[PDB]
């Protein structure tokens, strides 16, 4: 309904789910960009077993939310694109929308939610795909907008674990 | 027993003919199953995609003050102008004959307190583009209302004009809260052929 | 619809590299993007698998043409007359001047398909001992598949 | 295992041959029933004309 | 009388331009009434629709020629080395000379039949490097269907 | 029988009639010719329909008519080829039999009745053919010819009629 909980994390919205650092969406602010898995390797239990196995495949639950009044003008581009950290990097835009996009329309919603599948040319590889966040209608009253990603269907290799017998 | 007929040890270049392999009895690395195969052109230029009719290049802007104004205006061409960079245009740049119909979408991005009527006019392709709200409303279009539907769709009819205008007027000036922007998209219906791939 | 088709769009003989040897000899590392047009065509997708299929065209200007297909990790001549020319393992094609030569290469990548991508090499020699020959390979590309279409680059 | 016989690589203008087409998979631009479909020669040498007699 | 049918009175080869090329190149806007016997033949009706056969005949005088088609709407060459010699979407043919090429091109109109236009153009070009060679085409109709018979021109 | 009414036309003979200027057939005049649909673009109700819709499809049914005595001679020619306003144009002929035409013999006739379907190479085309009127055998007694055309079976374009919903 409203209270998504996974593992030690609860979420709310209208394997355990990441939440990054709070960036202030300023009216002459250009946009962001975070890699996956990059954004994840200083993340706790998930840095751990990404530092640990050589090779994995994983799924991502990514949802961005802008907490605001309903007097807030401006609108997001929410967008995954496959080919810095846990920061990400402070950064033609009208043919990114053949990728699976969605847009933050200050007017009628606050959050945007993408399931993201492992897409890579093999089934398994060493820890693809980059979650861009872009301002197309300018911030007309800063807004503080919260990234949540949740990793799923994680699976990993034999090594660390086989016997020689 | 065989004679030579004309137009033997010829080379076609578009002649699709099946080959002796270089590497026989090689196994290819095996085909997996990788998401979001494309058999089809016809499934990515069905997408909507923002049209450039001005970052701000892709923001139409309104402003206050302004009645029995018009907010745009433009024409169908989709090979120059507005439509030349989109994605639309740039596959129909690969073919010479379309013969289709289109999908003109609206996305509102101002405050939930403002409000507006804005009369959306489709001129077909032979007329002339109105000149006043009487003579845009008289024609193809549809009254929208900014203060409850902020997103509309209309679909522009199959034309094959290889192509008529398709302005926006104020009815009512924006009334904004004590500018703000429109975001135009455009796609393809289901219906959209595509033939004769040229260069 | 049979021309927007994965099939019929990108499965068109083009011209991929054009040379000239003197009788000394040209290799010549597999990129489809040498050609803008069909660069243009290949940057649409993230990932592509298609065999291949070149036809090569020898002309003469004032003979026999080894055309050798070097696979993906295999080494490439640095003379016309060192021993890979000699090695049973590269196929090579002997055909004479003003004919031409045809054949098909499979899948040779190492994922299950191309990232826009080592695809092998070309290697050309003339045959006969001790003439301007121009040789210009034409790639069509087969069973094309392709997913995760990009947007089109526009710069 | 064949042997060419005499006449091969031959240029006749009247023998009819089937042929590669040089546009594959492209479709035509469809047939529409026009009215007067002439398939022979015999039905129009049929019609009255006038003589120029004088 | 099968010799009255439109089958058999229209799907005849005819010779309908002849030129020479130097090694630069010559293109030409394809127009069957440029022989005035089958344009006194094609004006005896209002509409037609009928598919091509062009047969190529090169011979020297003191190599190898490519025959490219030109579709309708597509450009032409200026230069004998312009980038649409190169180009994929142009079906072009690589033949010797003294040998002769030949090829069918469907019926590319815009309306359901030719109304007596355009149905493209061939340009010609001798590939060798740095001879008078004379290229003849010869088109063919198949499949020839006719509508609205007219009078024939007498002035 | 002898009253073909069509709207508010009325037609004597042995959607609607639009009669054209009578023209006077002299002992010394050359002929005729009315391109369609052009002869009606200054014609009432179709002038309207030929100048709101591009595209558009209609036969034609043209009634030739001479009001003469038994004591006229000379013959007219009738004659509609495919491929000047109302008016139309004041101007080998052996050869023009192969169309569909009719001769009007003012010894036994005075009428000629020509059906025209739509003959184009598009199923649709912006608003083809052209009716012609000869004198070969010449008028021996100056005599009026009424001609009369009514478009039939007419259709039009799906613009100015769909919404964008």
Known sequence: V???????????????????????????SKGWCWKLPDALKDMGVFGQNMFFHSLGRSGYTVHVQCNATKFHSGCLL???????????????????????????????NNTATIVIPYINSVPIDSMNVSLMVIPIAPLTVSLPITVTIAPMCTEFSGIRSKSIV | PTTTLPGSGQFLTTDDRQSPSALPNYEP??????????????????????????????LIPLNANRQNEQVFGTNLFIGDGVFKTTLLGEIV??????????????????????????????????????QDRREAMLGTHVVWDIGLQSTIVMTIPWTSGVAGFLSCWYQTSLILPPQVYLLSFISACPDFKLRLMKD | GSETDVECFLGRAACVHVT?????????????????????????????????????????????????????????????????????????????VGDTSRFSVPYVGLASAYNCNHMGSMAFRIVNEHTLVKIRVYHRAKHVEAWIPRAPRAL
């Open chain 1, 78 to 108: 929410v967008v995954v694109i496959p080919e810095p950290g846990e920061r990400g990097i402070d950064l033609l835009l009208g043919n990114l929308l053949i990728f699976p996009h969605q847009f933050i329309n200050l007017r009628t």
């Open chain 2, 29 to 58: 690395t095996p085909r997996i199953h990788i998401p979001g195969k494309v058999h089809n052109l016809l499934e990515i230029i069905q997408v909507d995609t923002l049209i450039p009719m001005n970052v701000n290049s892709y």
């Open chain 2, 93 to 130: 740049q690969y073919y010479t004959h379309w013969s289709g119909s289109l999908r003109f979408s609206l996305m509102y991005t101002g405050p939930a307190l403002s409000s507006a009527k804005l009369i959306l006019a489709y001129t077909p392709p032979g007329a002339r583009g109105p």
């Open chain 1, 2 to 28: 409203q209270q998504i909980t996974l593992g030690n994390s609860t979420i709310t919205t209208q394997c355990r789910f990441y939440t990054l650092d709070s960036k202030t969406w300023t009216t002459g």
């Open chain 3, 20 to 96: 000239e040897i003197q009788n000394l000899f040209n290799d010549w590392k597999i990129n489809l993007s040498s050609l803008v047009q069909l660069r243009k065509k290949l940057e649409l997708f993230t990932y592509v698998r298609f065999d291949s299929e070149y036809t090569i065209l020898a002309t003469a200007s004032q003979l026999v043409v080894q055309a050798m297909y070097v696979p993906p990790g295999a080494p490439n001549p640095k003379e016309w007359d060192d021993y890979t020319w000699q090695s049973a393992s590269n196929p090579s094609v002997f055909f004479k």
